């Protein structure tokens, strides 16, 4: 079984 | 070194109640040690915890495909990861080792190396459970996926009644008893 | 959306090419894909927030660049003939599994010899009287011939305005000499109107082919005029008989 | 039934340091070694029933590094406030002479996640057999850490755990005898 | 080695015909599956996606079920329209990262049903700005296939369908031209099998 990462979101600028 | 430090933290949290029957997902961003923006699956959208994160909440909620991706996270991310490690995390059971010794007005029952943390330890004196003068170190996490605890009963140490330490753990179907 | 430039480009083997892409979706991840004649759609590069994620291209021939998360640029240092393809730019919400949103594509033709580049010759042919009396309709035919490469966009203009109804342009060109590799192409198009509309002398019909060729910066050292990007047209007015 | 799984990431400046871990009810499932770009499971057996592509972690750290610069500007460059750690030393079994055991130096409730930890046996540093965990998350968003020293108990040897932090004016030593 | 295998070659159907585009995948990870469509002149575009192992996707009358037992994602539509002519791409991507693998891409061409065929070959002229003379084969039904010319100095285009929208009128046409005076409209398309009732005007 493969774990799935929640992706990190890029902050506003 | 004395120059200032700056820390950014992100925590993606999954909360499970009665297994995967009820799941709550939390996408949490922290500057230093202060949450500034958060997605709560109960809320359904990114909300700003402090004004520092109000720029991100408006931006992220507007992105195409974002809310659909995040509103589905409890199924695609939380519930999925639960099952990947269920067999060695939720279902992990480790029977403890129980040692009894004195310290001799003080008598200690040392329960070591068990998983999960849920345990119940009682002290019996000739079949009678003394409920006073019972001190425990609490449950301590060893950091290596095992727990341990020390529960002591301050009792007159005399060569009469038999002293039995009884522990109950989700790894054992029957209580475990060590006799002094 | 997803916008790419240029739409078309032709150059010689050994030159440098630069493509550019912008997306307004707010997405963190962008992609370059190569699409070939046989509809093979394979990945080249992937960028997430100005950082390289995927690279499936040959070791050092290409030079992607992302100054911003909304921009993704591609650069071929020295083009080979095998670089002739359509290059599509895509975006996705983040680097996890997601829908891809594509651009219109950049059509790049890499040639060994720029003197194979020819603009089209455009002619229009007026409806047949027999078709007018048999079907009460009138079809004009437009022939764009001798162009290379097939970077053309044909359109029809009636009374100064572009028209789409009654129009059929061939989806594929036909090679004038199908044996040769650098054969020049031909293209046909039809505009069908009612016979009364064609029979009005006040009506103007024009077939326009927009060719995409060389530029001003290109050095041309040959007899004919420089085959630069240009529009070539042919026209006919309606005839009462 | 009731459980909590947390994917915990951070990036620290100007140290340029980042970590990526999974936490299950307070224990580390795995972390991603940024240097080797490898997934390190807390228990070797975990790697035979599950898997994780470290590539996604490295991508997530790169986003946290860029976002940190953005957030530092948002706060008008307010730095983190140091918080000294709480150090505790203990063993994982009752201590018996000449029976192998492990000392556990537990460092808790501290930030930023930068610590110097040394095992001192009779005042002199010891690194033979020692091991440590990565920085582990906390509900109050500080950090905790474990250091281990396997040893053979004796009446001759004493031990300390020396922890250096920026919230501490001087090093911190936690002793253990018997 | 993730791979996707789709129906080979171009598919051509009369409108109103069911459609089936077979797609088989192969992967060691748990994937989500996609169908992309690429209409003429545009880039690829999501038709639908199915993240869950045995679920169904639908859009625009298209439908495909993610059969994990058979590792298939066959696309189906019960009645294709002329507006469905495009290239269809089956794709998979692992569910832990966007790593999309596309299939070869099957071009679908939907042909209209011409209800009142009037096949005929006409000759056209210009302002004699060109030395060619074109022949137009028009108003034939969609059964007819035009054959490419074998003479190298004779050029024959494929059939093309135009729509006169205000008249609800569709027609097929192909163009043939040459500059040799040997070329005539009566023998231009005779490499093709055309309707026997084809109208050849006296020029
Ligand atoms: C959890 O949900 C299942 C669903 O059928 C139920 O049978 C079970 O009793 C629940 N457990 C608790 C502790 O409520
Ligand atoms: C940021 O802090 C500096 C020093 O404390 C101050 O001079 C400046 O005005 C501040 N800027 C804002 C926007 O508050
Ligand atoms: C650890 O030791 C190094 C070497 O002197 C020093 O630069 C650093 O500041 C120390 N860190 C802490 C937290 O004491």
Coordinates of N, CA and C in Angstrom, one line a residue, chain E residues 2-193:
Chain E
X2 N 3.9 2.0 -16.2 CA 2.5 2.4 -16.5 C 2.4 2.4 -18.1
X3 N 1.3 1.9 -18.6 CA 1.1 2.0 -20.0 C -0.4 2.0 -20.3
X4 N -0.8 2.6 -21.4 CA -2.2 2.7 -21.8 C -2.2 2.3 -23.3
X5 N -3.2 1.5 -23.6 CA -3.4 1.0 -24.9 C -4.8 1.3 -25.4
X6 N -5.0 2.0 -26.5 CA -6.3 2.4 -27.0 C -6.5 1.7 -28.3
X7 N -7.7 1.9 -28.8 CA -8.1 1.4 -30.2 C -7.1 2.0 -31.2
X8 N -6.7 1.2 -32.1 CA -5.8 1.6 -33.1 C -6.5 2.2 -34.3
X9 N -5.8 3.2 -35.0 CA -6.3 3.7 -36.2 C -7.5 4.6 -36.1
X10 N -7.9 5.2 -37.2 CA -9.0 6.1 -37.2 C -10.3 5.4 -37.3
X11 N -11.3 5.8 -36.5 CA -12.7 5.3 -36.6 C -13.6 6.3 -37.3
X12 N -14.4 5.8 -38.2 CA -15.3 6.6 -38.9 C -16.7 5.9 -38.8
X13 N -17.7 6.7 -38.4 CA -19.0 6.3 -38.1 C -20.1 7.2 -38.7
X14 N -21.2 6.7 -39.1 CA -22.3 7.5 -39.4 C -23.0 8.0 -38.1
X15 N -23.5 9.2 -38.1 CA -24.1 9.7 -36.9 C -25.3 8.8 -36.5
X16 N -25.5 8.7 -35.2 CA -26.5 7.8 -34.7 C -26.0 6.4 -34.3
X17 N -24.8 6.1 -34.6 CA -24.2 4.8 -34.3 C -23.6 4.9 -32.9
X18 N -23.9 3.8 -32.1 CA -23.2 3.6 -30.9 C -21.7 3.8 -31.1
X19 N -20.9 4.0 -30.1 CA -19.4 4.1 -30.2 C -18.8 3.3 -29.0
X20 N -17.7 2.7 -29.3 CA -16.9 2.0 -28.3 C -15.4 2.3 -28.6
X21 N -14.7 2.9 -27.7 CA -13.2 3.0 -27.9 C -12.6 2.2 -26.8
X22 N -11.9 1.1 -27.1 CA -11.4 0.2 -26.1 C -10.1 0.8 -25.5
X23 N -10.0 0.7 -24.2 CA -8.8 1.2 -23.5 C -8.5 0.2 -22.4
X24 N -7.3 -0.3 -22.5 CA -6.7 -1.2 -21.5 C -5.5 -0.5 -20.9
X25 N -5.4 -0.5 -19.5 CA -4.2 0.0 -18.8 C -3.5 -1.1 -18.1
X26 N -2.3 -0.7 -17.6 CA -1.5 -1.6 -16.8 C -0.6 -0.8 -15.9
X27 N -0.7 -1.1 -14.6 CA 0.0 -0.3 -13.6 C 0.1 -1.1 -12.3
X28 N 1.2 -0.9 -11.6 CA 1.4 -1.5 -10.3 C 0.9 -0.6 -9.1
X29 N 0.5 0.6 -9.4 CA -0.1 1.5 -8.4 C -1.6 1.7 -8.6
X30 N -2.3 2.3 -7.6 CA -3.7 2.5 -7.7 C -3.9 3.8 -8.5
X31 N -4.5 3.8 -9.7 CA -4.6 5.0 -10.5 C -6.0 5.6 -10.5
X32 N -6.1 6.8 -11.0 CA -7.3 7.3 -11.5 C -7.2 7.4 -13.0
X33 N -8.3 7.2 -13.7 CA -8.4 7.1 -15.1 C -9.0 8.4 -15.7
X34 N -8.7 8.7 -16.9 CA -9.2 9.9 -17.5 C -9.6 9.6 -19.0
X35 N -10.5 10.4 -19.5 CA -10.7 10.5 -21.0 C -10.5 11.9 -21.4
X36 N -9.6 12.2 -22.3 CA -9.4 13.5 -22.9 C -9.9 13.5 -24.3
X37 N -10.5 14.7 -24.7 CA -10.9 14.9 -26.1 C -10.2 16.1 -26.7
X38 N -9.9 16.0 -27.9 CA -9.2 17.1 -28.6 C -9.9 17.4 -29.9
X39 N -10.7 18.5 -29.8 CA -11.5 18.9 -31.0 C -10.6 19.6 -32.0
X40 N -10.9 19.7 -33.3 CA -10.1 20.3 -34.3 C -9.7 21.7 -33.9
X41 N -8.4 22.0 -34.0 CA -8.0 23.4 -33.8 C -7.8 23.7 -32.3
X42 N -8.1 22.8 -31.4 CA -8.0 23.1 -30.0 C -6.9 22.2 -29.4
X43 N -6.7 22.4 -28.1 CA -5.8 21.5 -27.4 C -6.6 20.4 -26.7
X44 N -6.0 19.5 -25.9 CA -6.8 18.5 -25.2 C -7.6 19.0 -24.1
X45 N -8.6 18.3 -23.7 CA -9.6 18.8 -22.8 C -10.2 17.6 -22.1
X46 N -10.4 17.7 -20.8 CA -11.0 16.6 -20.0 C -12.4 16.3 -20.5
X47 N -12.6 15.0 -20.7 CA -14.0 14.6 -20.9 C -14.6 14.2 -19.6
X48 N -14.0 13.2 -18.9 CA -14.4 12.9 -17.5 C -13.2 12.2 -16.9
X49 N -13.2 12.1 -15.5 CA -12.3 11.3 -14.8 C -13.0 10.5 -13.7
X50 N -12.4 9.3 -13.4 CA -12.9 8.4 -12.5 C -11.8 8.1 -11.5
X51 N -11.8 8.7 -10.3 CA -10.8 8.3 -9.3 C -11.0 7.0 -8.6
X52 N -12.2 6.5 -8.5 CA -12.5 5.3 -7.6 C -12.6 4.0 -8.5
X53 N -12.1 2.9 -7.8 CA -11.8 1.7 -8.6 C -12.9 1.2 -9.4
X54 N -14.1 1.0 -8.9 CA -15.2 0.5 -9.8 C -16.3 1.5 -10.0
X55 N -16.1 2.7 -10.5 CA -17.1 3.7 -10.7 C -17.2 4.0 -12.1
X56 N -18.2 4.9 -12.4 CA -18.6 5.3 -13.8 C -18.3 6.8 -14.0
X57 N -17.9 7.1 -15.2 CA -17.7 8.5 -15.6 C -18.6 8.7 -16.8
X58 N -19.1 10.0 -16.9 CA -20.0 10.3 -18.0 C -19.9 11.8 -18.3
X59 N -19.9 12.2 -19.5 CA -20.0 13.6 -20.0 C -20.3 13.6 -21.5
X60 N -21.2 14.5 -21.9 CA -21.5 14.7 -23.3 C -22.1 13.5 -23.9
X61 N -22.8 12.7 -23.1 CA -23.3 11.4 -23.7 C -22.3 10.3 -23.7
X62 N -21.1 10.6 -23.3 CA -20.0 9.6 -23.3 C -20.0 9.0 -21.9
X63 N -19.5 7.7 -21.8 CA -19.6 7.0 -20.6 C -18.5 5.9 -20.6
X64 N -17.8 5.7 -19.5 CA -16.8 4.7 -19.3 C -16.7 4.3 -17.9
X65 N -16.7 3.0 -17.7 CA -16.5 2.4 -16.3 C -15.1 1.9 -16.1
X66 N -14.6 2.2 -15.0 CA -13.2 1.9 -14.5 C -13.2 0.4 -14.0
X67 N -12.9 -0.5 -14.9 CA -13.0 -1.9 -14.5 C -11.7 -2.4 -14.0
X68 N -11.5 -2.4 -12.7 CA -10.2 -2.8 -12.2 C -10.0 -4.3 -12.3
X69 N -11.0 -5.1 -12.4 CA -10.8 -6.5 -12.6 C -10.3 -6.8 -14.0
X70 N -10.8 -6.1 -15.0 CA -10.3 -6.3 -16.4 C -9.2 -5.3 -16.8
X71 N -8.9 -4.3 -15.9 CA -8.1 -3.2 -16.2 C -8.4 -2.5 -17.5
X72 N -9.7 -2.0 -17.6 CA -10.2 -1.5 -18.8 C -11.0 -0.2 -18.4
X73 N -11.1 0.7 -19.4 CA -11.8 1.9 -19.3 C -12.4 2.3 -20.7
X74 N -13.2 1.3 -21.2 CA -13.7 1.5 -22.6 C -14.7 2.6 -22.6
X75 N -14.5 3.5 -23.6 CA -15.4 4.7 -23.8 C -16.6 4.3 -24.7
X76 N -17.8 4.7 -24.3 CA -18.9 4.3 -25.1 C -19.9 5.4 -25.2
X77 N -20.6 5.5 -26.3 CA -21.7 6.5 -26.5 C -22.7 5.8 -27.4
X78 N -24.0 6.0 -27.1 CA -25.0 5.2 -27.8 C -25.4 5.8 -29.2
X79 N -25.1 7.1 -29.4 CA -25.5 7.8 -30.6 C -24.6 9.0 -30.9
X80 N -23.5 8.8 -31.7 CA -22.5 9.8 -31.9 C -23.0 10.9 -32.8
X81 N -22.7 12.1 -32.6 CA -23.1 13.2 -33.4 C -21.9 13.7 -34.2
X82 N -22.2 14.5 -35.2 CA -21.2 15.1 -36.1 C -20.2 15.9 -35.3
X83 N -20.7 16.6 -34.2 CA -19.9 17.4 -33.4 C -18.9 16.6 -32.5
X84 N -19.0 15.3 -32.5 CA -18.1 14.5 -31.7 C -16.8 14.1 -32.5
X85 N -16.6 14.6 -33.7 CA -15.4 14.3 -34.4 C -14.3 15.0 -33.7
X86 N -13.3 14.2 -33.3 CA -12.2 14.7 -32.5 C -11.2 13.6 -32.3
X87 N -10.2 13.8 -31.5 CA -9.3 12.8 -31.1 C -9.5 12.5 -29.6
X88 N -9.7 11.3 -29.2 CA -10.0 10.9 -27.9 C -8.8 10.2 -27.2
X89 N -8.4 10.6 -26.1 CA -7.2 10.1 -25.4 C -7.6 9.5 -24.1
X90 N -7.4 8.2 -23.9 CA -7.5 7.5 -22.6 C -6.2 7.7 -21.9
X91 N -6.3 7.9 -20.6 CA -5.1 8.2 -19.8 C -5.3 7.7 -18.4
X92 N -4.2 7.4 -17.7 CA -4.2 7.0 -16.3 C -3.1 7.8 -15.6
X93 N -3.3 7.9 -14.3 CA -2.2 8.6 -13.5 C -2.3 7.9 -12.2
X94 N -1.2 7.7 -11.5 CA -1.2 7.1 -10.2 C -1.8 8.1 -9.2
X95 N -2.4 7.6 -8.2 CA -3.2 8.5 -7.3 C -2.3 9.2 -6.3
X96 N -1.0 8.9 -6.2 CA -0.1 9.5 -5.3 C 0.6 10.7 -5.9
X97 N 0.6 10.9 -7.2 CA 1.2 12.0 -7.9 C 0.7 12.1 -9.3
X98 N 0.7 13.3 -9.8 CA 0.3 13.6 -11.2 C 1.4 13.1 -12.1
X99 N 1.3 11.9 -12.6 CA 2.2 11.4 -13.6 C 1.4 10.7 -14.7
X100 N 0.8 11.6 -15.6 CA -0.2 11.1 -16.5 C 0.4 10.5 -17.7
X101 N 0.0 9.3 -18.0 CA 0.4 8.6 -19.2 C -0.8 8.5 -20.2
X102 N -0.6 9.0 -21.4 CA -1.6 9.0 -22.4 C -1.5 7.9 -23.3
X103 N -2.6 7.5 -23.9 CA -2.6 6.5 -24.9 C -2.3 7.1 -26.3
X104 N -2.4 6.3 -27.3 CA -2.0 6.7 -28.6 C -3.0 7.7 -29.3
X105 N -4.3 7.7 -28.8 CA -5.2 8.7 -29.3 C -5.9 8.3 -30.6
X106 N -7.2 8.0 -30.5 CA -7.9 7.5 -31.7 C -8.7 8.7 -32.2
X107 N -8.6 8.9 -33.5 CA -9.4 10.0 -34.2 C -10.7 9.4 -34.6
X108 N -11.8 10.1 -34.2 CA -13.1 9.7 -34.5 C -13.7 10.7 -35.5
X109 N -14.2 10.2 -36.6 CA -14.8 11.0 -37.6 C -16.3 10.6 -37.8
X110 N -17.2 11.4 -37.4 CA -18.6 11.2 -37.6 C -19.1 11.8 -38.9
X111 N -19.7 11.0 -39.7 CA -20.2 11.5 -41.0 C -21.7 11.6 -41.0
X112 N -22.2 12.7 -41.6 CA -23.7 12.9 -41.6 C -24.4 12.0 -42.6
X113 N -25.7 11.8 -42.4 CA -26.5 11.1 -43.3 C -27.2 12.0 -44.2
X114 N -26.8 11.9 -45.5 CA -27.4 12.8 -46.5 C -28.7 12.2 -47.0
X115 N -29.8 12.9 -46.8 CA -31.1 12.3 -47.0 C -31.5 12.3 -48.5
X116 N -31.1 13.4 -49.2 CA -31.5 13.5 -50.6 C -30.3 13.7 -51.5
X117 N -29.5 12.6 -51.8 CA -28.3 12.7 -52.5 C -28.6 13.1 -54.0
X118 N -27.7 14.0 -54.5 CA -27.8 14.4 -55.9 C -26.4 14.4 -56.5
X119 N -25.7 13.3 -56.6 CA -24.3 13.3 -57.0 C -24.1 13.8 -58.4
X120 N -23.0 14.6 -58.6 CA -22.8 15.3 -59.8 C -21.3 15.8 -59.8
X121 N -20.8 15.9 -61.0 CA -19.4 16.4 -61.2 C -19.5 17.6 -62.1
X122 N -19.1 18.8 -61.6 CA -19.1 20.1 -62.2 C -17.7 20.5 -62.5
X123 N -17.6 21.4 -63.6 CA -16.4 22.1 -63.9 C -16.6 23.6 -63.5
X124 N -15.5 24.1 -63.0 CA -15.5 25.5 -62.6 C -14.4 26.3 -63.3
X125 N -14.5 27.6 -63.3 CA -13.5 28.5 -63.9 C -13.2 29.6 -62.9
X126 N -12.1 30.4 -63.2 CA -11.7 31.5 -62.5 C -11.7 32.8 -63.4
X127 N -10.9 33.8 -62.9 CA -10.6 34.9 -63.8 C -9.3 34.6 -64.6
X128 N -9.0 33.3 -64.8 CA -7.8 32.8 -65.5 C -6.6 33.5 -64.9
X129 N -6.6 33.7 -63.6 CA -5.3 34.0 -62.8 C -4.5 32.7 -62.5
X130 N -5.1 31.6 -62.9 CA -4.4 30.3 -62.7 C -4.6 29.5 -64.0
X131 N -3.7 28.6 -64.3 CA -3.7 27.7 -65.4 C -4.4 26.4 -65.1
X132 N -4.9 26.2 -63.9 CA -5.7 25.0 -63.6 C -7.1 25.2 -63.9
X133 N -7.8 24.0 -64.0 CA -9.3 24.0 -64.1 C -9.7 22.9 -63.2
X134 N -10.6 23.3 -62.2 CA -10.9 22.4 -61.1 C -12.2 21.6 -61.5
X135 N -12.4 20.4 -61.0 CA -13.6 19.6 -61.1 C -14.1 19.4 -59.8
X136 N -15.4 19.5 -59.6 CA -16.0 19.4 -58.3 C -17.0 18.2 -58.3
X137 N -16.8 17.2 -57.5 CA -17.7 16.1 -57.2 C -18.4 16.4 -55.9
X138 N -19.7 16.7 -56.0 CA -20.5 17.2 -54.9 C -21.8 16.4 -54.7
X139 N -22.4 16.6 -53.6 CA -23.8 16.2 -53.3 C -24.0 14.6 -53.3
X140 N -22.9 13.9 -53.0 CA -23.0 12.5 -52.9 C -23.2 12.1 -51.4
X141 N -23.7 10.9 -51.2 CA -23.9 10.4 -49.9 C -22.6 10.0 -49.2
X142 N -22.7 9.7 -47.9 CA -21.5 9.4 -47.1 C -21.0 8.1 -47.4
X143 N -21.7 7.2 -48.1 CA -21.1 5.9 -48.5 C -19.9 6.1 -49.3
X144 N -20.0 7.0 -50.3 CA -18.9 7.2 -51.3 C -17.6 7.6 -50.6
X145 N -16.5 6.9 -51.0 CA -15.2 7.2 -50.6 C -14.4 7.6 -51.9
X146 N -13.7 8.8 -51.9 CA -13.0 9.3 -53.0 C -11.6 8.7 -52.9
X147 N -11.1 8.2 -54.1 CA -9.7 7.7 -54.1 C -8.7 8.7 -54.5
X148 N -7.6 8.7 -53.9 CA -6.5 9.6 -54.2 C -6.0 9.3 -55.6
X149 N -5.5 10.3 -56.3 CA -5.2 10.1 -57.7 C -3.9 9.3 -57.8
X150 N -3.7 8.6 -58.9 CA -2.5 7.9 -59.2 C -1.6 8.6 -60.2
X151 N -2.2 9.5 -61.0 CA -1.4 10.4 -61.9 C -0.8 11.4 -61.0
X152 N 0.5 11.6 -61.1 CA 1.2 12.6 -60.3 C 0.9 14.0 -60.6
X153 N 0.4 14.3 -61.9 CA 0.1 15.6 -62.3 C -1.4 15.9 -62.1
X154 N -2.1 15.0 -61.4 CA -3.5 15.1 -61.1 C -3.7 15.1 -59.6
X155 N -4.5 16.0 -59.0 CA -4.6 16.2 -57.6 C -6.1 16.0 -57.2
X156 N -6.3 15.1 -56.3 CA -7.7 14.8 -55.8 C -7.7 14.9 -54.3
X157 N -8.6 15.8 -53.8 CA -8.8 16.0 -52.4 C -9.8 15.0 -51.8
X158 N -9.8 14.9 -50.5 CA -10.8 14.0 -49.9 C -12.1 14.7 -49.8
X159 N -13.1 13.9 -49.5 CA -14.5 14.4 -49.3 C -14.5 15.3 -48.0
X160 N -15.3 16.3 -48.1 CA -15.4 17.4 -47.1 C -16.9 17.6 -47.0
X161 N -17.3 17.8 -45.7 CA -18.8 18.1 -45.5 C -18.9 19.5 -45.0
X162 N -19.7 20.3 -45.8 CA -20.1 21.6 -45.4 C -21.5 21.7 -45.0
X163 N -21.8 22.7 -44.2 CA -23.2 22.9 -43.6 C -23.7 24.3 -43.9
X164 N -24.7 24.3 -44.7 CA -25.4 25.6 -44.9 C -26.5 25.7 -43.8
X165 N -26.2 26.4 -42.8 CA -27.0 26.3 -41.5 C -28.4 26.8 -41.7
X166 N -28.6 27.9 -42.3 CA -29.9 28.5 -42.5 C -30.8 27.6 -43.3
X167 N -30.3 26.6 -44.1 CA -31.0 25.8 -44.9 C -31.1 24.3 -44.4
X168 N -30.5 24.1 -43.2 CA -30.4 22.7 -42.7 C -29.9 21.8 -43.8
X169 N -28.9 22.2 -44.5 CA -28.4 21.5 -45.6 C -26.9 21.1 -45.4
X170 N -26.6 19.8 -45.6 CA -25.3 19.3 -45.6 C -25.0 18.7 -46.9
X171 N -23.7 18.8 -47.3 CA -23.3 18.2 -48.6 C -21.8 17.8 -48.5
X172 N -21.4 16.7 -49.2 CA -20.1 16.3 -49.3 C -19.5 16.7 -50.6
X173 N -18.2 17.0 -50.7 CA -17.6 17.4 -52.0 C -16.2 17.1 -51.9
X174 N -15.6 16.8 -53.1 CA -14.2 16.6 -53.3 C -13.8 17.4 -54.5
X175 N -12.6 17.8 -54.6 CA -12.1 18.7 -55.6 C -10.9 18.0 -56.4
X176 N -10.9 18.1 -57.7 CA -9.9 17.5 -58.5 C -9.4 18.5 -59.5
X177 N -8.1 18.7 -59.7 CA -7.6 19.7 -60.6 C -6.4 19.3 -61.2
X178 N -6.0 19.9 -62.4 CA -4.8 19.6 -63.1 C -4.6 20.7 -64.1
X179 N -3.4 20.8 -64.7 CA -3.1 21.8 -65.7 C -2.9 21.1 -67.1
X180 N -2.7 19.8 -67.2 CA -2.6 19.1 -68.4 C -3.9 19.2 -69.1
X181 N -3.9 19.5 -70.4 CA -5.1 19.6 -71.2 C -5.7 18.2 -71.4
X182 N -5.0 17.1 -71.2 CA -5.5 15.8 -71.1 C -6.6 15.6 -70.0
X183 N -6.5 16.4 -69.0 CA -7.4 16.3 -67.9 C -8.8 16.8 -68.2
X184 N -9.8 16.0 -67.9 CA -11.2 16.4 -68.1 C -12.0 16.0 -66.9
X185 N -13.2 16.6 -66.7 CA -14.0 16.3 -65.5 C -14.6 15.0 -65.6
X186 N -14.8 14.4 -66.8 CA -15.5 13.2 -67.0 C -14.7 12.0 -66.5
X187 N -13.4 12.1 -66.5 CA -12.5 11.0 -66.1 C -11.7 11.3 -64.8
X188 N -12.0 12.4 -64.1 CA -11.2 12.8 -63.0 C -11.3 11.9 -61.8
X189 N -12.5 11.6 -61.4 CA -12.8 10.8 -60.2 C -13.0 9.3 -60.6
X190 N -12.6 8.9 -61.8 CA -13.0 7.5 -62.1 C -12.1 6.5 -61.5
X191 N -11.1 6.9 -60.7 CA -10.5 6.0 -59.7 C -11.3 5.7 -58.5
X192 N -12.4 6.4 -58.3 CA -13.2 6.2 -57.2 C -14.4 5.4 -57.7
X193 N -15.1 4.7 -56.8 CA -16.4 4.0 -57.1 C -17.5 5.0 -56.7

